[PDB]
Amino acid sequence: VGRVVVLSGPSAVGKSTVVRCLRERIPNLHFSVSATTRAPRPGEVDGVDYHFIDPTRFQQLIDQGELLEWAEIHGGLHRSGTLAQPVRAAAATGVPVLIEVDLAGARAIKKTMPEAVTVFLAPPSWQDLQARLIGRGTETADVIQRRLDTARIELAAQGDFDKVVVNRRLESACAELVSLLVG
Ligand SMILES: Nc1nc2c(ncn2[C@@H]2O[C@H](COP(=O)(O)OP(=O)(O)O)[C@@H](O)[C@H]2O)c(=O)[nH]1
């Protein structure tokens, strides 16, 4: 049986680089393809970037209990979420699975699939994070203050997770995750 790992953390912090490394380290890693009801952009392959389904079917799947999690996107313009069946099918086939979602999504997935292992990817310190949120200082004080506030709230609830990986160094963050996914 493949391990299922749900990767989340602070919302203002992109994890695509970490995801990219894991996929390079674990050759047969199945990165969860979210379902969505928005249309494909050119270059997007159905079954690879998303599973593109229409609003009516997405609702069916909600009603049948077939999303581990879902959400309204851009205030309900469309929906996206994680399909249960591919995740379980991959796992039973023995392939390891990584799901990368926001915090509400990971919380929701722990309920619908409790054998999944949730991981909060934490900053090495509050100051490391703060520095990155201020960044180049191209945003307004109001916006930055909101980010810093948002971040402290999110950091304060990392204890809801099965596991904390402190991202001190990319390669050892990635090493800890590899261990959870196959070790
Ligand atoms: N709840 C939930 N949100 C998703 C899922 N997939 C994508 N999203 C959200 O949709 C937003 C925008 O999608 P897009 O611009 O194509 O790139 P993305 O940011 O990687 O998803 C993201 O901020 C995600 O939080 C999912 O499976 N579940």
Rounded Cα–Cα distance for residues 144 and 87 (Å) = 37
Domain CATH for 104? 3.40.50.300
The reply to whether 168 and 147 lie within a common domain is yes
Kindly provide the resolution of this structure in angstroms, with one decimal: 2.5
Are residues 81 and 52 both part of a single domain?
yes
One domain, residues 125 and 141:
yes
Which of 17, 33, 44, 53 has its CA nearest to residue 99? 33
Could you tell me if 53 and 135 lie in one domain? Answer: no
Question: Do 64 and 85 reside in the same domain of the chain?
Answer: yes
Give the domain-ending residue among 47, 80, 95.
95
- Dist. CA 70 → ligand 1 center (Å): 10
Q: Rounded CA gap, 119 and 164, in Å?
A: 6
Q: Is 12 annotated as a binding residue?
A: yes
Method of determination is X-ray
Instruction: Quote the ligand 1 centre to 115 CA distance (angstroms).
Output: 23
Do 41 and 64 fall into the same domain?
yes
Q: Ligand 1: which residues within 6 Å by Cβ?
A: 34, 69-71, 73, 80-82, 101-102, 105
Query: Are 27 and 50 part of one and the same domain?
Result: no
Three-class DSSP category at 12: coil
Structural contact between residues 30 and 96, judged by C-beta atoms closer than 8 angstroms: yes
CA distance 109 to 151: 21
Same domain? 12 vs 65 = no
Q: Where does a domain end: 41, 74, 95?
A: 95
The domain total for the chain is 2
Per the listing, tokens 């469309």 go with: 78
Rounded Cα distance between 100 and 51, Å, is: 16
Domain that holds residue 20: 1-32+96-183
Claim to verify: residue 9 and residue 73 sit in the same structural domain: no
Same domain, 154 and 101: yes
Alpha-carbon distance values, 158 to 29, 42, 75 (Å): 25, 37, 25
Cβ within 8 Å of residue 76, ≥6 positions away: none
Q: Which of 40, 35, 33 is nearest to 19 (CA)?
A: 33
Q: Are strands 67-73 and 78-83 parallel, antiparallel or unpaired?
A: antiparallel
Mutate to test the pocket of ligand 1, among 80, 107, 110 (most ligand atoms within 8 A of CB): 80
**Is residue 125 marked as binding?**
no
Indicate if 90 and 101 belong to the same structural domain: no
Last residue within a domain, chosen from 79, 95, 111: 95
The sign of the CA dihedral 46, 22, 169, 171 is negative
The answer to whether residues 150 and 89 belong to one domain is: no
SS3 46: strand
